Design a protein around this ligand. Structure first.
Ligand SMILES: CN1CCN(Cc2ccc(NCc3ccc(C(F)(F)F)cc3)cc2)CC1
Ligand SMILES: CN1CCN(Cc2ccc(NCc3ccc(C(F)(F)F)cc3)cc2)CC1
Ligand SMILES: CCCCCCCCCCCCCC(=O)O
Ligand SMILES: CCCCCCCCCCCCCC(=O)O
Lengths: 59, 178, 278, 250, 250, 278, 59
């Protein structure tokens, strides 16, 4: 019941670490700071009709 | 109440002014004095949060020849409790008919804005009111007592639950027992 | 295979519509001793609700699975009175009200025990306090019933050869230890409605079944030029619990450590009238 | 046992342990308007559990000298809950009703009541050739009393009980949907009335769909008891209500 | 052409020949509550076309010295049509909104307005450490005016425009859903706001879901014309409204 | 298998050459509420660039995943005033400005909590300081809402049977502990634009939703001949965080711990003129 | 001789922990607070003849 996952490193320069959970409550686990998904559309493009950057904004 | 046992009986009379109130109480199972020391309130007092529906069962303990009808209504939280039967009947209610079956139940549904409510209830987490009114009145034949009594039972449904174990405030000591 | 791979939400609410039939779930009869099993779906229209609440925190294991203090006492490192330099406590769970009430909600219990000891020391006030003392050490002795009992701090009985003991030094973590189910019967009894003698005479009540032994504590060899006082607190934490025959919680305040004696108390508080709701 | 009945509408329930069967109008259960019979074009509102629920009107006293009472609908419910508001804010309306009447007495009382719903219960004035206002026959939830003697005041309806204010024999009202409340074996009457009219929908403030009448055919009687009167209570619940034509209220 | 928009809710329609695109909240369209997120048990009411329709609030004047205005919802609609009645008669409520703001002027006028919906727009009092009643920030449909200078009266909210009564930079309000009304190319703004809260449902009389603000960033200006002011009108339409917990009104 | 084997760089820049066409990416219309999505490649010639920068450190989890102090208070081991020998703090995150502002950038939050306690002691000045005291011990008590509250250092309430508590001895590592998401609602609310009573009266603002309980601290049994003062610092560290509805950061200085009251402040600083760049 | 089991978590939002026993006495094990079985019939329906909620309690 041991998880093996990669660790943060450079771009092009054994980059593995092991984790085990000792407690029966999920709140005791360590921070899951390895997620890097993001989507700015909800705040940058809240319009109904899709607008193309190349075409004029209006007409 | 000079006699403690009198606390368990709700008086009823024969010639009641039409549409009179029988009783009224706040729905605070863990804080109101009515439910404080009941078998349910005692359990809730060991916790901080509670949720689910409740059951109120009423039993008529009058004569076998007596008859009557009663309206029992639950009013969700609001700015004012009901003052008359017309106000009360707008909320959830049931018409109780006294006959061979001597008891009727009134499921208080779980209507709340939050998934849980505080045992130490406040204005934010208020729960409402429960009241009972005469529907038709009590009629008795000759040679019977002019008064009767009713009793109420409280219990939790199968969707009830509690949370956040805490220490009860009903018991305390000042010195070590010997 | 060097590994062995080893949740019950509350009931949901079903949609209900208008009804008009001879079935009457609302009416019942409490005279049978039967609690009605009606649900809100049986007396009003309801929507379909998926409920994820669980009763995990309401289990007896979790309810009783909390460490609670059961006894404290003070003893001095040096003093004229011999009896004041050590403690001797007959084991019982009736001393402290909170844990007593928590346990007394059931008639019979069966569990393992986890015991933790918290010890603190302080220097007594006086006209001359300047002194230097190394760290103190404490000994905890458990004497099953019938064993020898020490009569003074430096008695021979403190040389335990069979009696379990713990030696602890100040500044470290509190001492901890486990005890199995050590009752002669099949389960502990919080209440005992009976007598000791066969002719209905002698001791009465749960005092008759309390034969768990004693606990003794002392300073190993510390003897300061000036008095020093230490306090010990005992904490019990049931494990692997099982309970039978629940009983109503107590209402009157406790008054004796080995009796049910009480004073009559009102059922509950009062209000202006039966209609007052404000 | 078939002598116990339970009715559940909206967030209200009615339970009776001592009742007869249930009469269903002319054999027709209330239902929504069909697509091939409608005339209005805009979508109708269907307040469901908010308007379809039991509403208990005020209670009356039954004395030894009572003659009878009547109520006119939906003017009786015109100012009740959200039903009244929805009536006020809409031009057209349509709904069936369920009527429940409660009356209980000991086994030593005697009496018989007739409960009947009369559709289009047009009434005539006391002084023939003299008009009456819309206050001598409907003023909200209050009940109007019949009279044993011939009415003489010109400002109110002819209340002769034996004619029922309609110029017809009171004993012939059995043709309409009805039930009897006999204290020997009954305590309540239940009638389910579908929507009856010559048009798919109509304004509820201008037109009285039907009238409810309670007449004691056998006067109440008792001897040597502390109870002096027998209250009567009426409960009504609209069914399958739908409204159309939103305008300014009133 | 994409510069013409038409919106049809209930028995009302809005047509604009001169408008920009439509902003949809945080990309979420209003919808009904799901079965696996609800907490209340009793069937909810869904007044459909009776509550979901456009309701035009009172109009304001835009002068050369205007500073801005704000409205708090749903207290603004608390006494409008059947929506207000249904709010009064129920304990819990839930609904999304569609906000439309109208402002038109000739081609020779200049000005820019910011239209933004601020959820949970908690406001502070003028005199720090002094409470205000529920009348200095919401009194029905009337609009409340910002102030250029610092507020001094202790009985009302701090109306400093540059702080927006929330202790934050007025120029940073762009983070919330918003649109601009520029007289050069625009006459109306449309915002669709879904239901945003920390609980599935809430009482609408105790909690202000969101606040609508209109701030002129560029003051109105004109020369040699007979028109002295430019009226502004606001129209709102609840969407997918459903209520629960019938009690006595108020 | 006794193991289970479980990065997104920023966008690159594409080569662009001279252009002459009717497409005009530069011109747009802010009136739509839409932020332009143009890139430097759309308005000038650019070379091909492979970019390895990542936004790992800008995630909300990392931004809020730092322990920050939220409260400190002092209590004495011995003194004449009973209220001065222990602490009683209603839990809230509005006391300290840095963490308050960090949290107030979002409207709703949902996270687990990690609490760490730092305790230090010092001897009060006086005319006579010579004394010898063993190591001190401290108790931290958490009381959910509605539970009993101690009224003095040696009150019976300190015998926790259900209330969690921590006993800590000076000289060891700071105490640490975890708390799950304990809100009655689906998420914490930093702001609440509403009232307490249904008639729009009573308390106003986020003070209405603060019902997290209290924390109590005391010296277990230490009572020195001379006064000793101790200080406790509480640190919060959100874990497994989720946020909704971002809002602009605050500009005016805080003035109340349970209100948004403020004083008007200038938008920003000034300069000589619109053209000054030096 | 290592047990792997799930840990408490949410409803719909690596939830595994490992446990090993070091002592030869079962009393030394940690609390088994992961059992959630319950049956209120013994106290709510102690009657001999089964009663149906829909039918009348008596006759
Ligand atoms: C009245 N209650 C009946 C049940 N009984 C349970 C119980 C049984 C045994 C213990 N032992 C505690 C203990 C004492 C001494 C040591 C020693 F240090 F000697 F090893 C270890 C554990 C506790 C409770 C409680 C009373
Ligand atoms: C205003 N902010 C709302 C969100 N809330 C989050 C939050 C919830 C609970 C805690 N608990 C801290 C804690 C107190 C006491 C103990 C004890 F020692 F009693 F076990 C443990 C943890 C913290 C923050 C913060 C306020
Ligand atoms: C309470 C858990 C203690 C774990 C002690 C360290 C791990 C010992 C077992 C070796 C790792 C294998 C774990 C696994 O089977 O997933
Ligand atoms: C007294 C027991 C000490 C155990 C030390 C940690 C475990 C080391 C072995 C790795 C885990 C495998 C255990 C197993 O085979 O079940």
């Amino acid at each position: 019941g041991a998880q093996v996952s990669t660790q943060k490193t450079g771009a092009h320069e054994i980059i593995h670490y092991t984790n085990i959970n000792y407690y029966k409550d999920a709140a005791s686990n360590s921070a899951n700071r390895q997620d890097f998904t993001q989507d700015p559309s909800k705040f940058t493009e809240p319009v109904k009709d899709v607008m193309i950057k190349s075409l004029p904004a209006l007409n | 109440t000079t006699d403690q046992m009198e606390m368990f009986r709700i008086p009823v009379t024969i010639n009641a002014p039409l549409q009179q109130q029988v009783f009224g109480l706040r729905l605070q199972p863990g804080l109101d004095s009515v439910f404080k020391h009941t078998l349910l309130g005692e359990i809730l007092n060991y916790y901080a949060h509670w949720s689910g529906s409740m059951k109120l069962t009423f039993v008529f303990c009058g004569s076998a020849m007596a008859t009557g009808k009663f309206l029992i209504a639950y009013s969700p939280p609001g700015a004012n409790p009901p003052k008359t039967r017309k106000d009360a009947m707008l909320g959830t209610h049931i018409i109780w008919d006294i006959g061979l079956q001597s008891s009727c139940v009134l499921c208080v549904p779980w209507i709340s804005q939050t998934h849980y409510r505080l045992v130490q209830q406040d204005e934010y987490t208020s729960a409402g009111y429960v009241t009972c009114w005469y529907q038709t009145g009590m009629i008795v034949p000759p040679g019977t007592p002019n008064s009767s009594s009713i009793m109420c039972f409280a219990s939790a449904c199968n969707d009830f639950s509690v949370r956040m174990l805490r220490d009860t405030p009903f018991i305390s000591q000042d010195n070590k027992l010997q | 295979g060097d590994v062995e791979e080893a949740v019950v939400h509350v009931a949901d609410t079903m949609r209900s519509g208008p009804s008009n039939s001879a079935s009457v779930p609302a009416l019942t009869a409490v005279e049978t001793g039967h609690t009605s099993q009606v649900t809100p779906s049986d007396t009003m229209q309801t929507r379909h609700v998926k409920n994820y609440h669980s009763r995990s925190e309401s289990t007896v294991e979790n309810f009783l699975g909390r460490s609670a203090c059961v006894y404290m006492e003070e003893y001095k490192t040096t003093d004229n009175d011999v009896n004041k330099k050590f403690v001797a406590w007959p084991i019982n769970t009736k001393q402290m009200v909170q844990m007593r009430r928590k346990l007394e909600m059931f008639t019979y219990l069966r569990f393992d025990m986890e015991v933790t000891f918290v010890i603190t020391s302080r220097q007594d006030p006086g006209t001359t306090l300047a002194q230097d003392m190394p760290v103190l050490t404490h000994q905890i002795m458990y004497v099953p019933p019938g064993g020898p009992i020490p009569a003074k701090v430096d008695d021979y009985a403190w040389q335990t050869s069979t009696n379990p003991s713990i030696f602890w030094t100040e500044g470290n973590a509190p001492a901890r230890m486990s005890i199995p189910f050590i009752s002669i019967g099949n389960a502990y009894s919080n209440f005992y409605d009976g007598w000791s003698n066969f002719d209905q005479r002698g001791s009465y009540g749960y005092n008759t079944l309390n034969n768990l032994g004693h606990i003794y504590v002392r300073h190993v060899s510390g003897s300061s030029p000036h008095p020093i006082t230490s306090t010990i607190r005992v904490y019990f934490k049931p494990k692997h619990t099982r309970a039978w025959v629940p009983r109503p919680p107590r209402l009157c305040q406790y008054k004796k450590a080995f009796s049910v004696d009480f004073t009559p108390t009102p059922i509950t508080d009062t209000r202006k009238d039966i209609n007052t709701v404000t | 046992s078939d002598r116990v009945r339970s009715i559940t509408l909206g967030n209200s329930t009615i339970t009776t342990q001592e009742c007869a069967n249930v009469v269903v109008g002319y054999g027709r259960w209330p239902t929504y308007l069909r697509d091939d019979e409608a005339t209005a074009e805009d979508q109708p509102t269907q307040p469901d559990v908010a308007t379809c629920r039991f509403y208990t009107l005020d209670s009356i006293k039954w004395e030894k000298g009572s003659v009878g009472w009547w109520w006119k609908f939906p003017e009786a419910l015109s100012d009740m809950g959200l039903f009244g508001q929805n009536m006020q804010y809409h031009y057209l309306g349509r709904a069936g009703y369920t009527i429940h009447v409660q009356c209980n007495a000991s086994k030593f009382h005697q009496g018989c009541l007739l409960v009947v719903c009369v559709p289009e219960a047009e009434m005539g004035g006391a002084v023939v050739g003299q008009a009456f206002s819309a206050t001598a026959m409907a003023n909200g939830d209050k009940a109007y009393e019949f009279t044993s003697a011939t009415q003489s005041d010109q400002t109110k309806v002819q209340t002769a009980i034996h004619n029922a204010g309609m110029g017809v024999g009171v004993g012939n009202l059995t043709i309409y949907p009805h039930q009897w409340i006999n204290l020997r074996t009954n305590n309540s009457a239940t009638i389910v009335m579908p929507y009856i009219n010559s048009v798919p929908m109509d304004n509820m403030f201008r037109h009285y769909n039907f009238t409810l009448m309670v007449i004691p055919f056998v006067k109440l009687d008792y001897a040597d008891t502390a109870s002096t009167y027998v209250p009567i209570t009426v409960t009504v619940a609209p069914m399958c209500a739908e409204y159309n034509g939103l305008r300014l209220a009133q």
